[PDB]
């Protein structure tokens, strides 16, 4: 008996967000859950890992109820309808009836009872921009399908008052810290699965907006008023990353981010397609870059850098270095090195908020 009227654009906005998480084994998983309670329409999409909820206030008289309908089909019908049209939606004999202007649609349904949180340990509000920065500055370093399952995601840590993101695949690490002034009384850690965290970052579009965060023992919740995002957590312990951060780095290199990125990209063309190895030769004011492949093709480049100290010959995966440079927001970049067998520490020119660790390759 569920029935409501809605403007095309009012339905389209939450429908597009929700359909984005809809990808399926169970047939109901391909469906969007529609719930009319009073003058509110709720739209829910899930893949069992993440759940996204969109909400719309209904203007004209609406009859309550709940149903599930093919998410992609309803979104495509909504998108294809003329701009600003009023859509009439009703449930009739296990079918969804859609009317808009001279267009009529009948969709198959699945019962809402078949559609598939968690006390909060910590809850705080944060700028969408600050949370998105933490994810976007580190997400490239997360492992993908590593047997060490706890690496296939991002650590979100609250400590002191600081919110920190940590991502690693065992070869390289990315970390970003922001003083959000969150009272915690203890260090709190959560591992958000890779698919979930990447979805969340894409949802954080409000440059001026705020997001309410709830950290639970097995879930994370992000609320913006227009949407509620819920993700299950990776049930494991994140490695002791503090133990792998290089501390005694004696070789400080200051270089131009663009010059280094351009030289690494040029040399990468002639590096091994699988191993992506490049050789770095550091000396006073100079960085020599060399790359070669099995066909004996070779690329060489010399980059002027701010460096005074002893020589260093070190091997690196060029893609790992390019990944780091792609997230450095300053014109200059700091590389802190020691020996050929030890990690490179990378920072922005003017702050230590972001830190990148890259293990070398044997030459």
């Amino acid at each position: 008996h569920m029935h409501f009227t809605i403007q095309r654009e009012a339905l389209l906005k939450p429908l597009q967000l929700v359909a984005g998480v809809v990808e399926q084994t169970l047939p109901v998983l391909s469906n969007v859950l529609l719930v009319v309670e009073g003058q509110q329409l709720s739209l829910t999409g899930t893949d069992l890992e993440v759940e996204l909820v969109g909400r719309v206030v209904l203007e004209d008289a609406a009859e309550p109820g709940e149903i599930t309908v093919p998410a992609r089909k309803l979104m495509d019908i909504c998108k294809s309808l003329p701009n600003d049209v009023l859509i009439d939606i009703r449930v009739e004999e296990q079918k969804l009836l859609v009317k808009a202007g001279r267009s009529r649609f009948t969709l198959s349904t699945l019962p809402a009872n078949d559609f598939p949180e968690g006390p909060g340990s910590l809850n705080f509000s944060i700028a969408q921009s600050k949370l998105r920065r933490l994810i976007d500055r580190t997400s490239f370093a997360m492992a993908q399908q590593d047997v060490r399952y706890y690496l296939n995601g991002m650590l979100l840590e609250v400590n002191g008052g600081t919110l920190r993101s940590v991502a690693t695949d065992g070869h390289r690490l990315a970390m970003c810290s922001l003083d959000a002034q969150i009272p915690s009384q203890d260090r709190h850690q959560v591992i958000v699965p890779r698919k979930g965290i990447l979805e969340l970052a894409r949802l954080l579009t409000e440059q001026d907006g705020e997001v309410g965060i709830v950290l639970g023992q097995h879930h994370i919740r992000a609320t913006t008023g227009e949407f509620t995002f819920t993700s299950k957590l990776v049930d494991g312990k994140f490695p002791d990353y503090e133990r792998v951060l290089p501390r005694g780095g004696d070789k400080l290199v200051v270089g131009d981010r663009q010059q280094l990125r351009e030289a690494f990209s040029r040399t990468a063309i002639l590096s091994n397609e699988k191993y992506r190895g490049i050789r770095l030769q550091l000396s006073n004011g100079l960085l020599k870059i060399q790359a070669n492949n099995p066909e004996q093709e070779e690329a060489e480049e010399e980059v002027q850098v701010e460096y005074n100290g002893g020589n260093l010959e070190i091997g690196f995966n060029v893609s790992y270095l390019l990944d780091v440079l792609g997230v450095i927001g300053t014109e200059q970049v700091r590389f802190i090195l020691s020996d050929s067998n030890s990690s490179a520490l990378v920072h922005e020119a003017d702050n230590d908020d972001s830190a990148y660790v890259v293990m070398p390759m044997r030459l």
């Binding site: 065992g170 070869h171 390289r172 490695p239 293990m359 390759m361």
Partner: peptide, 5 residues
């Protein structure tokens, strides 16, 4: 390639 752990 070397490992962090």
């Amino acid at each position: 390639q070397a490992d962090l752990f």
